[PDB]
Amino acid sequence: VLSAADKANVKAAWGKVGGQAGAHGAEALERMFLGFPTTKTYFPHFNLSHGSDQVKAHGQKVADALTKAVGHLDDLPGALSALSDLHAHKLRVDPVNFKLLSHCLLVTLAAHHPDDFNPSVHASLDKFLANVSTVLTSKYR
Template sequence: MLTAEDKKLIAQAWEKVKAHKDAGAESLERMFMSYPQTKTYFPHFDLHAGSEQVRNHGKKVLNALDSAVKNMDNLSQCLSELSNLHAYNLRVDPVNFKLLSQCLQVVMAVHLGKDYTPEVHAAFDKFLSAVAAVLAEKYR
């Protein structure tokens, strides 16, 4: 459960993160490098660093997270369509949501530097775990 302080920290940090337009692509690239098995869901993509397809998908990831940040109190409804897409059409292994969350946190730490405090990290960890759980709830 996110506390009021968690929500405040998430909203503040997110404003800084989304200013880095390629943070989503950087997170995906890191995931593909660290967890090569995740590439199997993107056989039609050019997965090289800086590819336009990865950049575009990274923007989609950031847009979805931006919506989730704005709707922290109603993640299930906010992410329902995305959950359906991943569960029923794309059939993505839900473990990948957690892997991408970890990679996003590394990217956040790089870009935010000293502003990525242990408190921000803990709040984002709870938030991204909640997002991953919502995205995976259609699999049950």
């Protein structure tokens, strides 16, 4: 799974994000919609203007899913079961969109916590999101 150093960096870094988890997931989805416009198609039902309520509310759901996964770093497949089948099977999300959101979460976190995003935290949070993306993309492979 992650090495023990990686788990420790992921847990502390997401631990000190704290209450801002919801806000960061929200701003991560905005930076992916603007920066990568092909991703706007999965959300037509939404209003995608800066500060939209649906984007704020869904931003909390994404971060709460990443706190469950920071909580169970070894139960990661079991923990994200419903979410792997909802993404691969039901929403058929293209794999690359998970590499784009992950990029916008590392940009959001650097912007808000310059202090904490040292190079090793950065490396542990990328391996953490690449393994979260592998679980969600697992019905494809």
